C-alpha cells in the first residue's frame, strides 16, 4: 500500500508515534517519505546482504528475520515480511523500539541527512490532524 502524505501522518498519529521519544509527527512522516516514499512494500538490499523493509526501511541485520541475513538478530521478534503489510502496525511497533535504542532517529540515515534540522512540521500541514 502506497500512502498519501496526509493519510500516513494520520495513520502514524493514530498509532501513537506523535512526539514518541520527543519526535514530533512531522519527523516520522518526513523519514517515511525519503525511506520508502510512503510504500509499505518497499525493500532495499544492503551491500552487507541485509535488507531494509517497509515504510521506515527497518534493517534485517538487527530487527527482523528474513532467513537470509547470516549472523543477524531479530530484536523486534517478527518476520521481516510483516513490515510490508498495508497495516503499518508492525512497522510502527518495531520503529518505536528502534528509536529507543539510544541514537534516536539517527538510526535512520535518511532522517539525519534529509529531515533533521528542517521544518518537519511542513510534512503535516493541510492535513486533518
Swiss-Prot record:
Single Gene Ontology BP annotation: defense response to bacterium
Active site (catalytic residues): 35, 52
UniProt note on tissues of expression: In the egg white and polymorphonuclear leukocytes.
Pfam families attached to this UniProt entry: Lys
Keywords: Allergen, Antimicrobial, Bacteriolytic enzyme, Disulfide bond, Glycosidase, Hydrolase, Secreted, Signal
Entry's Gene Ontology cellular component terms: cytoplasm; endoplasmic reticulum; extracellular space
Keyword Signal attached: yes
Reaction catalysed by this enzyme: Hydrolysis of (1->4)-beta-linkages between N-acetylmuramic acid and N-acetyl-D-glucosamine residues in a peptidoglycan and between N-acetyl-D-glucosamine residues in chitodextrins
EC number: 3.2.1.17
Disulphide linkage map: 6-127, 30-115, 64-80, 76-94
Entry keyword annotation includes Disulfide bond: yes
Major location category of this protein: secreted
Residues annotated for substrate binding in this entry: 101
Gene3D superfamilies: 1.10.530.10
Protein task: Lysozymes have primarily a bacteriolytic function; those in tissues and body fluids are associated with the monocyte-macrophage system and enhance the activity of immunoagents. Has bacteriolytic activity against M.luteus.
Assembly and binders: Monomer.
Similarity comment text for this entry: Belongs to the glycosyl hydrolase 22 family.
The name this protein goes by in its record: Lysozyme C
Organism, scientific name: Gallus gallus
Gene transcribed to yield this protein: LYZ
Amino acid at each position: 500500500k502506497v500512502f498519501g502524505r496526509c493519510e500516513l501522518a494520520a495513520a502514524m498519529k493514530r498509532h501513537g508515534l506523535d512526539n514518541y521519544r520527543g519526535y514530533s509527527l512531522g519527523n516520522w512522516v518526513c523519514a517515511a517519505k525519503f525511506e520508502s516514499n510512503f510504500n509499505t512494500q518497499a525493500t532495499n538490499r544492503n551491500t552487507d546482504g541485509s535488507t531494509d523493509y517497509g515504510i521506515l526501511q527497518i534493517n534485517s541485520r538487527w530487527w527482523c528475520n528474513d532467513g537470509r541475513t547470516p549472523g543477524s538478530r531479530n530484536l523486534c521478534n517478527i518476520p521481516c515480511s510483516a513490515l510490508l503489510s498495508s497495516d503499518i502496525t508492525a512497522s510502527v511497533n518495531c520503529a518505536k523500539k528502534i528509536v529507543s535504542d539510544g541514537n534516536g532517529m539517527n538510526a535512520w540515515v535518511a532522517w539525519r541527512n534529509r529531515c533533521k534540522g528542517t521544518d518537519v512540521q511542513a510534512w503535516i500541514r493541510g492535513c486533518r490532524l
